[PDB]
Symmetry: C7
Subunit: 280 residues, 7 copies
């Protein structure tokens, strides 16, 4: 062979070229493939890193982070190409794979919580437990909805204050809808002197509630002496009425009661402390 007398000495006279052509050429094929892969990945990364910016800038963005992210991802893709080259030549990169995988796991964990809100949003969207037009509470947070979307929900307070809350939080909690039900019960409590007649007061109260229309006479209308306290005996009342008027009626009756009790001669006592007196 011309291999090892022109470009090399006659090393053992053991001409390797024709004997091991495939072997010696395997390295070369590996090498060429590698470098080609490299350059193509490079140009691709450049193009794409600018292209994503091209597409995103139309949408709402910030420039600094846009640039930072595009450049960083570009660099990472590059790294990918590199490891592939190393693998082709026959180097052990499993360690590199391991470390980068650990990094991916760590970042996934870091963002997990945020991601959960995404999940929550999707879920509630398909389920539609409540809608923006509706008025509800999400647990300690009452007020009307304004909008609901990607990661957070937007609702207004009775005072008007706007509040925002993440989706992941709310789904975990319990939920209450008032809009979905038209009618609701109402409750009242009263306290009076022990002497006073329970029957008189009872029928009085009755006459009042009779007087009202908005009440649901169909539905029950309970009036009892609930329980006994230390200062006053305490009555309870129950009614049903449409959600819309619930508050108003709630106020109205109370005024009525006050007027009617004084007319009746009844009284609501003050805290009563009894004493025994001795001089010393």
């Amino acid at each position: 062979m011309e291999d090892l007398n022109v470009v090399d000495s006659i090393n053992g006279a053991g001409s390797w070229l024709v004997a091991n052509q495939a072997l010696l050429l395997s390295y070369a094929v590996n090498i060429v493939a590698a470098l080609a892969i490299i350059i193509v990945g490079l140009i691709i990364a450049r193009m794409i890193s600018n292209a994503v910016n091209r597409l995103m800038i139309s949408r709402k963005i910030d420039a600094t982070v846009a640039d930072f992210l595009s450049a960083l991802v570009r660099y990472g893709i590059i790294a990918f190409t590199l490891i592939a080259a190393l693998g082709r030549v026959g180097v052990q990169t499993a360690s590199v794979i391991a470390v980068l995988g650990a990094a991916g796991l760590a970042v996934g964990l870091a963002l997990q919580g945020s991601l959960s809100n995404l999940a929550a949003g999707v879920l509630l969207v398909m389920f539609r437990p409540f809608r923006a037009g509706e008025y509800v509470d999400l647990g300690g947070v009452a007020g009307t909805v304004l909008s609901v979307q990607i990661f957070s929900t937007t609702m207004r307070t009775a005072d008007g204050k706007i509040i925002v809350i993440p989706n992941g939080k709310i789904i975990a909690g319990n939920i209450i809808n008032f809009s979905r039900e038209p009618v609701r019960r109402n409750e009242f409590i009263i306290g009076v002197a022990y002497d006073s007649d329970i029957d008189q007061v009872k029928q009085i109260l009755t006459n009042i509630i009779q007087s009202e229309d908005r009440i649901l006479k169909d539905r029950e209308m309970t009036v009892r002496l609930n329980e006994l306290g230390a200062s006053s005996i305490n009555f309870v009342v129950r009614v049903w009425s449409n959600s819309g008027d619930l508050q108003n009626v709630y106020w109205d009756v109370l005024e009525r009661i006050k007027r009617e009790f004084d007319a009746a001669g009844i009284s609501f006592p003050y805290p009563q402390m009894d004493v025994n007196f001795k001089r010393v």
Copy 2:
């Protein structure tokens, strides 16, 4: 060989074609297989991405998310095909596998909590601890059930307000059924002047409870002086009666008591503060 004098020079005269036909053809078989795999996966992904939409739109859906998800999954399947190609040509994609696996782990973690509710629902369904017709409490949340399903349960409040709660939450908590048991005990407490006779009051109370039918005379009927306070000595009473009438009887007895005590001459005192008086 005709290999390296027509399409190539006489490179070492070492005709490789017949010598390494299998070797040189291995690349080609890899290549063709790869590209074929690619295109088939592509058309499949297209078809399926539209087909899932076809099937789902019949069901309740939102268009934006439907499109988003279908397109995204389509793209992902595509990616799968790509990596397979790279593998056939003989590139090291283990890093890619690692990163995508980390991503899958992260997303699974993010949605884990939601998924738990699914599990809870299935479990309770087969176990059937409670049923929609029944009235129960799930811990701080009393009211009647309305429905129970995929991830959440629906029940009504005594006031009527509708509430919803995730399944995963409830299973963790303790559970209480009232429907399942027909009868329940009841309790009462009373407070009186120290002077008053305990025997008189005792037999009085007794006579009352005797008077009632709904009480379970079979079952015990305890009446004791529970303990002594700072203002009044305090009695306790116990009874049993069917769940349905429990509340009513509870009210009835109290009225009786009030009437009977005044007849007896007994009195419930007010808070009593004793004093010693000196002028200065």
Copy 3:
């Protein structure tokens, strides 16, 4: 060879059939094995998906979920067969393996909590800390046991209300048994005027407890002035008696005491507020 002049042209005249028969046949063996595996797995999955239903329907089930689960698992098994085929032809499915493994991890995490209750149940069963016939508390939840099983335990309340609680929860908590011990101590507190004689009261109390049989005279019977308050001086008492009668005796003594104190001339004072008086 007849290979490449009948079914093919004379491509390099390099007849491959006899030269590479094993090689060219390897693909075929792979292929046939694959498809065979496929079909067998398919029929198996069909049979088994119906068979599990056959077996389970005898037991308590719901039809919708039964069908859903059987079909889903059927489909999954199918998928298994598919990947095996792909592997035989020589495709890289490690990515698929990775993603499905991530999914399995996620679901395991989701159900982990529920599973913990299983573990708890098994544990308590072999340990037998308490038994259904017995009466205990599990921390804030007192009442008698009714039954204990797979994931949850069932006990009754003193009021009769039935309650259910998951096994995983209880094992974590502390546990208290009353049935296992026959006898228990009891405690009492008293408050009196500062003027009153401690020795008189002491011997009185003593005489009372002497009067009782159910008390364990063998065991200690402590009677001290525990400590001094702002309104009265406060005594304490201790006794021992069998669990069964514990409550009754507890009540009995108190009645005795009241009677005996008035006979003694002692008194339990009311809250005493001293004053100094000046006119302005």
Copy 4:
């Protein structure tokens, strides 16, 4: 060759038997080895599944769970044998490995908490912070030990009520030993009229504590006016004495004090509310 003219046609006349005997026989060796492995594993699993029962039934067990577990583990071992067979023939089972590994991870997580108690038990055993004969508190749970073992510890309450608590819980908490120390301090508080002489009271108290033997005169004996309140001025006292008698002495001194103060003419006042009076 006799291969492909007797049992087969003259397919390409390319007699494969002698040419590829090793190759064609490799399949067979794989196959035979596989099936043999299968059957042996089967019989082994049967024997062992019954053998474990044989051994365990001697110990405390429940039959249902014993059977369930033995059968389940038997089945699992079987599955192992199966996958090995599949591997020998040359099928890709890595997916199966992955899923079963995910399952193992999930179950380990589920039982982790329980297992922690095991760890705790071992630890405390070698460390021996406290012993069964001793009396201690583990944080909110005071009472004497009864026994300590595998996963839980057993102690008695002062009232006698038996309580059980898991080992994992306690090790986490703080721990307090009374037995290990023979002597302890004691504290007292007092409140008196502002007018009264502090020196008189001081020396009085002193004389008392002098009177006692059980007190450790060697150790300090502090007596100060701790601080000033709104109703009275408040004294503090400190002493040391052996654990055993600690309670008794604590009571004794108090009686002494009461007697001695009345003799002294001192008094403990009641809550004093001053007033200004005007008529309207």
Copy 5:
């Protein structure tokens, strides 16, 4: 061959050189490649470890940690090169890979929480729920924003005190914006003698609110007797007005009220305790 008679004895006369040239040379190629890789990685690490410092020192830094980190990362890169060498010679380093991967996982977990704040910052930035110029509360922390960035946010307190809070914390919480809404409601409560006329007071209050301009007459203006207390009957009032003036008006009205009530003859009573008097 000249192999084993010059440099070695005639070991079995089985000249290995020409027979196994490729085999024996494989080791050598491995070896040379390895060492070359080593040295290049070394020089690279040196250069880069200094280069990063060169670049970072321009930015705000601390020298000690800068040096520490640069040196440590340098060393780690070195380690990478080493394992690659070991792999080429044909040693099993999978254990090393495993341990270092476990370490990476641990560190990722340790820093996860901090990293979460990064995520939060990015998210809020693109979402822009609130802006620095605006005044808001983040839950228990009210005050005006100053700046928001990488991991933390900076806002000022009403008192002026500067406060800082991590981003990860806030995103989790609920959020409230006042700037975004121009107008808000306001509330008031009042308490008066039971005797006093509700109509008189009502119209008075009305006249006041009429008097004000800043109030939104368009919007509702509620005036009711909210509920009844133990000492005074209690009124409520509601209004709407721009955020900017909200506080001022809130104060103004109150002054008005005080003046007007005394003019009216109304009075706000003090806590009223009723008594019954007996001498003993």
Copy 6:
């Protein structure tokens, strides 16, 4: 060949021995190596399982757990040897590896918490924030140190009660050292009649603190009227003094004050409730 006419028939006359000697012998080498590995591992495990006991029994141990652990680890090592054998013959044990790895992960998780205390101990040891001779608090747990070691720390209470707390717990918490600082401030509060002269009292207090030596006149000595209270006006005082005498001086001054105030004619009032009186 003599292979298949003596010990076998003339199967295809295709004598395999000389043709495939290496192949057929590979199995044998695998087999012999395997069994040898087995037996050696066995004897090793026996020896070592007894040897560890030999070494440990000298140290403090319990016999039951010693035996249990030694036997269990012995068995596990055995298992290792087994899997290696299976691997040599050419069986797929990756599943076994997976399951045992899952088990190791689970146990590591279970013991993690305990292990954390180890870490804490090491850390504090090198850091030496506090030392046994010193007196400190670790958050809600004040008292003097006794000893600190492997997993827990030991300190004494002021009352003398011994307490133990795990290391992992404390490091998490905040830490407070009193020994490390020689001097500390002190605070006092007072309340008096509004009429009384602030200047007189001020100079009085001043004269007192002047009277004391132990006070650090160098350091500030603040005396102000902190705030005006409800029943009385309230003064504050500040001083500095060595830790050792801090308590004593704190008491001393108070006595002084009491004496001096009565001399001054000042008084500390009682809670003052004003009234308005009307007969009905």
Copy 7:
């Protein structure tokens, strides 16, 4: 061949040496390489285990743990060498790798929390939110900084007590700086008789604040009647002034006020309880 007639019988006459020289020599090369690796690793571990001690002892250390750690790490490195040997001979050690990796994961988890403090320290160092010279609070822990470093931070209390807190804890919390801002607002509250003139008091207060210089007349100076209270009507005041003098001025004004009010004839009332009197 001389192989199997001198050192062995004529086994099948199938001389293996020259036929399979490479094969039979492969074992040997594996073996020699292995043992060499072993011994070198051993000597290295010895040297290094002593060398680390040599280097560390200069720094602050404890001997027992130093020795323990050095020996343990030495042993572990040894183990590494061992597994490599086993791998070369061709044994399956993947199980060993798995278990040791699980152990590494467990230990990383155990120390994770501690490590987090490291991260926190680094972060705060580069960010420099606060500096040692400055005075701040970290949430419930106010006092001046002393030093900040590796894992913990050191600050002094107003009382002087030294406190230490881990870095990981603080970063999580919210942070407050007083040093960074020069000026701060101040607040005051007052309560007076309802009769008293608001205008008089208002202008009085005004005159006072006018009197002061340190106040920022530029900045607002609010004086309103905040709200009407129960026993008294309650005023509020606001001011701004430099941090340094904030406390002093805060005290000064109060003294002024007291003096000026008595001069004005105003009074701060005591709690006023009204009564109604009847004899029985």
